[PDB]
Structure formats: C-alpha cells, structure tokens
Write a protein that binds this ligand. Structure first.
Ligand SMILES: *[C@@H]1O[C@H](CO)[C@@H](O)[C@H](O)[C@H]1NC(C)=O
Ligand SMILES: *[C@@H]1O[C@H](CO)[C@@H](O)[C@H](O)[C@H]1NC(C)=O
Length: 196
C-alpha cells in the first residue's frame, strides 16, 4: 500500500437501524477508519485485543461509534477495523501496535476537526440541499487537498454520507488521493440530513 485514507461518516446518513449508537445518531461526523489504500487483511494471526486500547475507550465511544451495524458490542466494529485495516497500517512505525494505530487515528480525527471546519464554513445539516461543490471546494481550500465525498443515492436527491482525506504513509500528513451503498457523490444537489 502507498497511502492512508482517513474516512469519516455522517451517522444520520449511514445508520441502518434505530439501535445503540444509531438510536439517536450523533450530530457530528465520526470516524469510520484509517485505511491503507491498497491492502487489507494483512495478518490473520494478529487479532484485535480490546485490552490494548482500554485507555482510549472513552474517546473511541465518542468519536468512533458503531453507526453502520450498530451492534451492541461496539468492539465488533473496532475488531473489524483492526483486522481489515490496522494490521496493514502497522507496517508504519507510528501505527505499529493496536494502541498506536487507534490512538493515532483518534489524534488525526481531532487535528483534522472536520466538524468545526464544516460549521465554520456555514455548512450545517439542513432541510435545504447543498451542492456537492459546496463541500468539495470548501474542504479543498481548508485542507489543501481534494477530499473524496461519498453519498447514498436517492431511494429524491443523494444524501452525503462519507468524507475521505488521504494521508501520507509515514507521518499521515494531508495529501491528494490521486461501501454499503456509498458511492462518489454526483455533482449537483445533495442532502446533508439533520439527525433524527
Ligand atoms: C503478524 O502479527 C504478529 C503479532 O504482532 C507478528 O508477530 C507477525 O510478525 C505478523 N506477521 C506479519 C506477516 O506481519
Ligand atoms: C492537491 O491537488 C490540488 C488540486 O489539483 C492542488 O491544488 C493542491 O495543491 C494539492 N495538494 C497537495 C498537498 O499536493
């Protein structure tokens, strides 16, 4: 793999069942994961061990909740993220343990502060549609790199669900990059839904 992708998602869009973390979806973008771009599932002999990240659990519950399957055991999601992505990300010294990977992921989420960025730009959940360019152009100005922005299609207009920012392999600095239904958002109107 060559780069990392910091993936954040909008709970009201991605939530699938009104349970657990999705019963009242958080009203802020949360962490989906920190993913090596081209490799997954790198070490079946290195299982997730919740005990190793015990210190991070309050932050993981707040910022890395399970808002896709919303299983009652929140650690099923983090296990999935570790096994699929973290074992590969551990080739990088800064990410070379469970604690370091998850801790760095949380740090990057704090440093990027996508939630404050959007709000400062005036991009808030609304009944009124935005244009996809509102998100893309404003995030490109703030982060200096082009995000990938992914949507659920109409099941009306597409709904924004996920924002991806690429990061360098060694130091996880912002760089340019160049699913459960999320696809690239089409140019045009997009709904950014206020949580239920
Ligand atoms: C798999 O992880 C174990 C536990 O960290 C480590 O000892 C081993 O070297 C890893 N194997 C590969 C191919 O990375
Ligand atoms: C990423 O690409 C954009 C769009 O072409 C460019 O303006 C920007 O300077 C690039 N950022 C980095 C960090 O390379």
């Amino acid at each position: 793999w060559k780069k990392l992708i910091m993936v954040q998602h909008w709970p009201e869009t991605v939530c699938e069942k009104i349970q657990n973390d999705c019963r009242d979806p958080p009203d802020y973008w949360t962490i989906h994961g920190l993913w090596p771009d081209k490799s997954e599932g790198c070490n079946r002999s290195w299982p997730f061990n919740l005990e190793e990240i015990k210190d991070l659990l309050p932050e993981m519950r707040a910022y890395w909740p399970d808002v896709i399957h919303s299983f009652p055991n929140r650690s099923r999601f983090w296990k999935h993220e570790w096994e699929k992505h973290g074992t590969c990300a551990a080739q990088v010294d800064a990410l070379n343990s469970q604690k370091k990977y998850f801790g760095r992921s949380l740090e990057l989420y704090r440093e990027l502060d996508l939630n404050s960025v959007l709000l400062k730009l005036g991009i808030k959940p609304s009944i009124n549609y935005y244009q996809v360019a509102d998100f893309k152009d404003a995030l490109a100005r703030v982060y200096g790199v082009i995000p990938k922005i992914q949507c659920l299609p109409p099941s009306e207009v597409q709904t924004i669900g996920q924002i991806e920012l690429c990061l360098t392999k060694q130091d996880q600095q912002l760089q340019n990059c160049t699913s459960r239904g999320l696809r690239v958002c089409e140019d045009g109107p997009v709904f950014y839904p206020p949580p239920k």
